[PDB]
């Protein structure tokens, strides 16, 4: 994924994006041949690809998910040229929603009913010996980050 986005279109999410399984926990795959198993695996990968396509249909440059993002959605976002930030905890997604104005979404069947956060520039900065993601020119800014050096 790109490391620098200008005029970002933030989409804050709280979805799975990690071996996303159907919540029917009594379901199982029971076939008589490994060809059918391979077909079901391809169907699962196609489901994940369709999920990523639905996310991308919002017309976004950045994507923050509260939970983890596995390798396949990661490469899908990279090929789409979309910067995807994973494992931003509840406080993190709440703060991004407060500072950028985005809506924490969990379904993407209605792109027009979900508002997107916006900021002038996102880049990576060095603070001491650690690298952090910087949101610059935020829209609302009702959330602050205070850096303490001691």
């Amino acid at each position: 994924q790109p490391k620098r986005i200008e005029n970002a279109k933030i989409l804050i999410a709280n979805t799975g994006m990690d071996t996303d399984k159907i919540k029917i926990f009594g379901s199982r795959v029971r076939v008589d041949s490994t060809a059918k198993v391979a077909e079901i695996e391809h169907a699962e990968k196609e489901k994940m690809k369709e999920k990523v396509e639905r996310i991308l249909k919002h017309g976004i440059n950045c994507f923050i998910n509260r939970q983890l993002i596995y390798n396949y959605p990661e490469q899908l976002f990279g090929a789409a040229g979309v910067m995807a930030i994973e494992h931003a905890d509840f406080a993190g997604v709440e703060r991004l929603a407060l500072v950028t104005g985005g809506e924490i979404a969990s379904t993407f069947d209605h792109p027009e009913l979900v508002k997107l956060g916006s900021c002038k520039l996102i880049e990576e900065v060095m603070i001491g010996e650690d690298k952090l993601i910087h949101f610059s020119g935020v829209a609302l800014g009702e959330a602050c980050t205070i850096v303490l050096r001691g």
Partner: protein, 116 residues
């Protein structure tokens, strides 16, 4: 084997989740921790419950989203993955609950979730 060994303190109980994808662990500081077997990242650490946890029980009907933890706080308190919050707690126990069995769940006093 996972053999992750990312832990500052000892592990009272390392309960593998019913879903064959992640593990649930509780350190000696009374904070439970959830780890992903595949990626290795710590999904979320559960605060509260200052004394060390002593037993971990996942939901029996799969549903890898809620679990109950008890330790030296004489507490029986239930969590939720989807919010990371203590959704339910109990006060009847008064002495260092050793083992907990999930039915409602029986710990050593049978609790009922539908009526607290």
């Amino acid at each position: 084997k996972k053999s992750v060994a990312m832990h500052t303190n000892y592990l009272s109980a390392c309960s593998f989740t019913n879903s064959d994808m992640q593990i649930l662990t509780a350190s000696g500081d009374g904070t439970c921790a959830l780890w992903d077997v595949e990626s290795g990242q710590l999904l979320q650490s559960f605060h509260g419950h200052g004394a060390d946890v002593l037993c971990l029980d996942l939901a029996p009907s799969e549903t890898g989203n809620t679990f109950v933890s008890g330790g030296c706080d004489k507490k029986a308190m239930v969590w939720d993955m989807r919010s990371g919050q203590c959704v339910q707690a109990f006060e009847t126990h008064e002495s260092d609950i050793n083992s907990v069995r999930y039915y409602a769940f029986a710990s050593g006093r049978l609790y009922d979730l539908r009526a607290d």
